[PDB]
Amino acid sequence: NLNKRYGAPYVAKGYASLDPRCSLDAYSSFQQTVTSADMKKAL
Amino acid sequence: ATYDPAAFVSDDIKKDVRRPFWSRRRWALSDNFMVPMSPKPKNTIKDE
Amino acid sequence: ERYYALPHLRGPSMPVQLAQPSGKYPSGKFTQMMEDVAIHPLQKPDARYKHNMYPA
Amino acid sequence: KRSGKPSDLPDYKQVYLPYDTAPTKTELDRERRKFMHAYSGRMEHRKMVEVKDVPQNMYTYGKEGMSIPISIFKDQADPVIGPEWTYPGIFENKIVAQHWYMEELFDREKSNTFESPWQRQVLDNQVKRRLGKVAWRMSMLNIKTIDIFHKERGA
Amino acid sequence: MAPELQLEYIPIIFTRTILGPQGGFAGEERLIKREVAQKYMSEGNAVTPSAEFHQGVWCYNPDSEQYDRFVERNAEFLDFAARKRQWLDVYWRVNTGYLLFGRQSWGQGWLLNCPLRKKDIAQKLWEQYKVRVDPRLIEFREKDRRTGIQDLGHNWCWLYLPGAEELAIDREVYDNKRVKVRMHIRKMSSYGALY
Amino acid sequence: PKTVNIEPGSNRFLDPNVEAKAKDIFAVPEFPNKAVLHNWRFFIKAGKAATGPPVGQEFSKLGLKAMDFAKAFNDRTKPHFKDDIELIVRIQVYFDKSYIFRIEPPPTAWFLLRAIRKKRGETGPVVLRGNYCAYLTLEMCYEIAKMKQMSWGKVEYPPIEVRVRRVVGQARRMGIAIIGIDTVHSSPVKGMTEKQYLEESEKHRKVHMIQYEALKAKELESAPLIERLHRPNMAPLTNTQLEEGLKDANLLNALWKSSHPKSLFTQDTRDREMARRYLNTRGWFKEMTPEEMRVVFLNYRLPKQEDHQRQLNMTNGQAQSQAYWS
Amino acid sequence: LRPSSLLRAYHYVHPKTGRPIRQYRKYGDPRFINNEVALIKGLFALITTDFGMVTQSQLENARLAILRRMPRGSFALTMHTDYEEFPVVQKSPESRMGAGKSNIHHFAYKFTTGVPLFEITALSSRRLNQAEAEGIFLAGRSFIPLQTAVVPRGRVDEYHVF
């Protein structure tokens, strides 16, 4: 009779808190660009 | 390109509703004709 | 070692023009108002012999 | 039932011909040869079947100027049939009046492509029935429990 | 080639679209078992990859029921028959597989004392079948949405394979959007059981 | 040779001669606002009504010497009638035992077997019998439909074309394959090409519409005032709006006001715009300016002439002209 | 050996002898959960949601009861039989009076989950409802010793039947 003792963030938990969304946003930043000024700010 | 588990995957602890006897018609539709579960004898599953 | 894993999405996740029919006889909740149906009390339907004969 | 049936069956008394050019014998059985079959059932379940008691000449059959023996009153003989466009909506009914499977009608509505502006009316009067077969299906269950196909069937 | 040593599976270009695991679909190249494939090259659902077929092949449409539909395999289709294969390989792998367990069950209700988590199904998917998924897709049944799986014997639970609409994938799998992964909880003493 | 009348469909009624004595006997002795006890129905011949089991019995179950009614029947049915015309009598017995009966034209099933010359048992539905029975043509049903008028006070309450689809369906349900439909070819004529036959229908079939509509619109101008009221169409609402619009009636109110056709009382910008500000919060219709709603939120049951009439009310000098006078 | 030279998959026949193959008790064990769904082509079919061993006499008594509750000219029941059969009391001291002949003769099927059993298939444009369907099968289901639920035409969507 879980989810009574533990929360809903139990059994209904996709413990894969690693990469359901970030990987996508990773390929987002891949798309836009990086250039001189994008390094000059880092400069 | 996003799939959200939450839209289609529904894990709801649903209350198994009683067949409403207090009203006559909804008692007859609800009569899911599998009440012949009486064939649940734990019979010999690998012999006869 | 081979590991099988889903491909990346290029279109809508839940199929729409590819959906298999629901699989249970689609007698809707409104053709036999079995349960789960909520109606305003002003807009009560189909009492043609009880209380729609004298509508309001 | 026996009662409510005609005992005396008057015969088609052709009043006046609908043509001046006699339909020569050769073509008569050339067009009637096409009528001995009539479709039935309107879907994939189309069934071209046979028709018993085929009339012999259909240039004269009903298109005009024949009588129909529904003689009812004292002074009203077997009424003559006026020409086609003299009856209202006939070539419009030809589009509407027929066995309509709802399978074949709802694709016409959701595509709003009605051959006729009354098939929207033969649709409602067809669904408004099937709902009634339910609102009677259920206003009975409020009496008792009626269970379909639960009694023996056949012999 | 010898009568003793025969290729355990052979390359195949499908012309038709077979449902089964060994099946494929229109125009993809697949190494399916020899015995199965050999009753395809006779059946016509498949043809060995001659250099000609490697560009186009006359696949099949159930519409007119004959080999008319020309499916040309340019580099673009070869990016379509990959994602469409890589997809229905996860399908036919979890649907064919029957993932086992060993658990402890003191007590009478035949109740697994530490019931299962959707973590503990993706864990036995990646363990046994190497099927790597998101445990957010696994929807449990109604009996086991509350307490987890919790009971010995055969349990099953639904895995949602979301991204199948641009692959045009239906009628070649049993359910476009789900699959029944089929547990089984073989109770074991502290010797071989965990948790 | 001689076409009796060349008009695009002016034969929708019986001859005023036969239509004179049509309702002399098919009349409803008005309901006395009593409580009916029995609504009996019989088949009885022209005037051969007896005191036997068919009639005299059900009276005698109630102690009425039906030897009288048969005479009062024959006081109205013995003349006027071709021999052997089985009529239907709708006897209605009130709590005072005083009956009131309407004589009615023969059942259309009786008509149908006459007009095809088939006896009892020869006709049948194909799924029970396997064969279409005697043919017919729509030209014939239009005259079975002329002696079958539900309101024998108002001879055409159902317009005649509407009445025919009824008798046609009852025919098909008996196996009566009529020619105009059910077959590959209509009735062949020695007059002209099939095209010169179809090109003469495409004009007739549409001339009837302006004939049929006008008769459908003249009917609505004398229809109950409630009938010409506004009832918005529900085909646009999708079945989640159609359900989320049933839990709270407020949406089906603001809708009505939002899409009411213009009138002298609904030319209030704020009243119309008050609704239009309610729906937008509900995410309902948002890209449809008022016009394209009225043309879709109209009472579809209006005769085209009348929907067109209500749709252009703002053009009709505005309804700001027509008001409750005084 | 073991299964080969089948007698068209009803039962396997010894290769070097026409005798029946006399398999093990838990051969073809139904205690799987069948992955492959059934693509029924009747209007409704009676699938077995559970597993068990069902005789032919229990399946024939069910047909004789389904064939009573069904409109005759419209629907024709369709009973599948391609499935494999299995033996009974076979062994020699394990038979009664050394009559191994009269005990093995019974042939029972080992049904897994979701095998279709019958079919209310159509012979016309006549239609059925789930209420009109379960009412038919409610007679036979009381004989078929394992749990079964009726399914509508086409691919059983086993998300719902379970």
Place this chain on the structure above:
Amino acid sequence: HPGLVPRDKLKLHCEFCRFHWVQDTLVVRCAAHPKEHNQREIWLEPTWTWGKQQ
């Protein structure tokens, strides 16, 4: 009165056949056909105890 083995088998055969709470057991009682169409859910006797019927 035939104990309809589960509660769910209960069906109202007649117009006068209704449900009743005969001591915690949902039953069907009809004035007409008094015992002919009567059905009673399966449950412990109205006066049971903890050692006799568990």
